[PDB]
Amino acid sequence: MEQRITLKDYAMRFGQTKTAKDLGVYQSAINKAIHAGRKIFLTINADGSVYAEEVKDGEVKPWPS
Amino acid sequence: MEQRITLKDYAMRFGQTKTAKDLGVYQSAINKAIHAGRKIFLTINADGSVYAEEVKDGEVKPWPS
Secondary structure, eight states, rough: EEEEEHHHHHOOOOOOOOHHHHHSSSHHHHHHHHTTTOOOOEEEEESSSSEEEEEEETTTEOOOO | OOOEHHHHHHHHHHHHHHHHHHSSSSSHHHHHHHHHOOOEEEOOOOTOOEEEEEEEEEEEEEOOO
């Protein structure tokens, strides 16, 4: 089954540094997106590969950009 | 003028590694205090100095000892 977890929750457990590492963006970007309240969720793969998406403008898109 | 923040939150933004460095301590230590729910909080000074204190045994003391 696919497993999803919000960006906030992921950050919460792993901290924003590790999160930044997993997703491959800057910590400033994640703190930014958490503060903004963006609707970002990560889906987790068994290989340990992680990716994020965002619900924005009536659709589900990748995050970032 | 005093700005405080929980070790938890602090570590969450910066990660236990830089936290450890900031307070001068073992990352393992951060780790355990956090898992243990110790009432540790940090105060931030404008020059960039960071210090930790703990509420325990009815007083506010430094951390660690």
